[PDB]
Amino acid sequence: TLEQVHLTEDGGVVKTILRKGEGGEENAPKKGNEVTVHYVGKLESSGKVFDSSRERNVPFKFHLGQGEVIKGWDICVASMTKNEKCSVRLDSKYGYGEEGCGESIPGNSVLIFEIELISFRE
Amino acid sequence: TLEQVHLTEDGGVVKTILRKGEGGEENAPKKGNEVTVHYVGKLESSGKVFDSSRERNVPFKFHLGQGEVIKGWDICVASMTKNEKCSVRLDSKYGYGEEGCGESIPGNSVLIFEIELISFRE
Ligand SMILES: CCc1ccccc1NC(=O)CSc1nc2cccnc2[nH]1
Numbered sequence: 305t306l307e308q309v310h311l312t313e314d315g316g317v318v319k320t321i322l323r324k325g326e327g328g329e330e331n332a333p334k335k336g337n338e339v340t341v342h343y344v345g346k347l348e349s350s351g352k353v354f355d356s357s358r359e360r361n362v363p364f365k366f367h368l369g370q371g372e373v374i375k376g377w378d379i380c381v382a383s384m385t386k387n388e389k390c391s392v393r394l395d396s397k398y399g400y401g402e403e404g405c406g407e408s409i410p411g412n413s414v415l416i417f418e419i420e421l422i423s424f425r426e
Numbered sequence: 427t428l429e430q431v432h433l434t435e436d437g438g439v440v441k442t443i444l445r446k447g448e449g450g451e452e453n454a455p456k457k458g459n460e461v462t463v464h465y466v467g468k469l470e471s472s473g474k475v476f477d478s479s480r481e482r483n484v485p486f487k488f489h490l491g492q493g494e495v496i497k498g499w500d501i502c503v504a505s506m507t508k509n510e511k512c513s514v515r516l517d518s519k520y521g522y523g524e525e526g527c528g529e530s531i532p533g534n535s536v537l538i539f540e541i542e543l544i545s546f547r548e
């Protein structure tokens with residue numbers, strides 16, 4: 305595998321599947337569901353890790369497709385099924401754009417996230 | 427009430443209690459617990475709302491005191507009890523600092539959040 309999945313027309317979100325998830329539409333999260341993910345985020349430019357839920361030993365929950373998180377995450381996680389692990393490359397358009405965010409993410413940064421979809425629920 | 431609670435020595439985190447929460451230490455979240463909050467965040471400078479879980483009609487979960495969220499939120503929520511509603515003023519040191527974050531939060535922004543602690547759990 306290492307299937308590469310193009311998720312936006314502009315090339316700004318491209319997912320590489322590292323471990324395939326479970327089969328079926330019943331194993332795919334729906335818009336508005338709560339998802340639980342583990343992730344590691346690094347800058348493409350330097351390879352430097354700026355955030356990791358794995359380092360914290362506890363995953364992160366959000367509601368899918370609601371704009372609670374960066375656009376790249378909504379788009380990426382919507383494409384995943386339970387237990388899938390992927391690495392997603394996000395152009396700055398799908399991250400923090402021209403401004404960046406705080407000390408660890410410069411403006412116009414391409415972000416690389418390893419994301420694992422642990423579970424989801426209503 | 428409208429009790430004002432100073433939470434850092436530098437004045438960078440100051441909470442005003444709008445509705446007092448439940449009594450007891452058993453109604454106070456512990457470091458590492460999951461908390462569920464509703465919030466509305468606005469810039470002090472303009473009054474402009476940059477993020478609201480209430481607009482989304484679904485609250486937000488994070489693990490308390492783990493640096494998953496801005497420092498101001500860890501500090502503020504640690505001081506709350508179940509059902510408390512507060513408004514917290516955060517100096518940029520406790521938000522997104524000199525750089526800001528994305529289009530909606532400029533560098534050196536004081537942030538004002540209304541936060542309600544809905545529940546928490548192990
Ligand atoms: C943590 C999940 C979350 C909830 C609500 C809003 C945004 C986020 N994080 C991300 O969207 C992307 S992950 C991330 N984005 C970051 C920006 C600066 C520093 N560290 C960061 N880590």
Ligand SMILES: CCc1ccccc1NC(=O)CSc1nc2cccnc2[nH]1
Binds near residue numbers: 467494530531
């Ligand atoms: C959403 C909760 C969350 C989870 C993980 C990491 C950060 C956050 N948000 C906050 O810390 C403060 S809330 C917030 N911070 C923001 C920065 C830019 C735009 N909107 C924002 N809303």
